Amino acid sequence: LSRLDPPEAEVQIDRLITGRLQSLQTYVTQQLIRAAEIRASANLAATKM
Amino acid sequence: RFASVYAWNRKRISNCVADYSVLYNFAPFFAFKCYGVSPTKLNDLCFTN
């Protein structure tokens, strides 16, 4: 936002937002998978208790 | 004096304040095309060479 001018920084900002959102979607997916695993382990632990 | 496109002249510019307005304000031009930087922002920047 300081080297490049408003409308040529946009495709750059668009690509940066896409890259930073694709890196967060997979993180949320892995977090959901690990949370499901932890939930299954906790259900097993509660049954054993 | 301007050299040929081979054996092209090269000048290293350092320890100075760069008022780029003195350049693009000049009437004879066909191109101030700028890759990786924009004409308007040159006066806000600092360059390591």
UniProtKB/Swiss-Prot annotation, chain B:
Effect of L23I: In strain: Omicron/XBB.1.5, Omicron/EG.5.1
Superkingdom of this protein's organism: Viruses
Biological role stated in the UniProt entry: Attaches the virion to the cell membrane by interacting with host receptor, initiating the infection. The major receptor is host ACE2. When S2/S2' has been cleaved, binding to the receptor triggers direct fusion at the cell membrane. When S2/S2' has not been cleaved, binding to the receptor results in internalization of the virus by endocytosis using host TFRC and GRM2 and leading to fusion of the virion membrane with the host endosomal membrane. Alternatively, may use NRP1/NRP2 and integrin as entry receptors.
Assembly notes: Binds to host ACE2. RBD also interacts with the N-linked glycan on 'Asn-90' of ACE2. Cleavage of S generates a polybasic C-terminal sequence on S1 that binds to host Neuropilin-1 (NRP1) and Neuropilin-2 (NRP2) receptors. Interacts with host integrin alpha-5/beta-1 (ITGA5:ITGB1) and with ACE2 in complex with integrin alpha-5/beta-1 (ITGA5:ITGB1). May interact via cytoplasmic c-terminus with M protein. May interact (via N-terminus) with host bilirubin and biliverdin, thereby preventing antibody binding to the SARS-CoV-2 spike NTD via an allosteric mechanism.
Name by which UniProt lists this protein: Spike protein S1
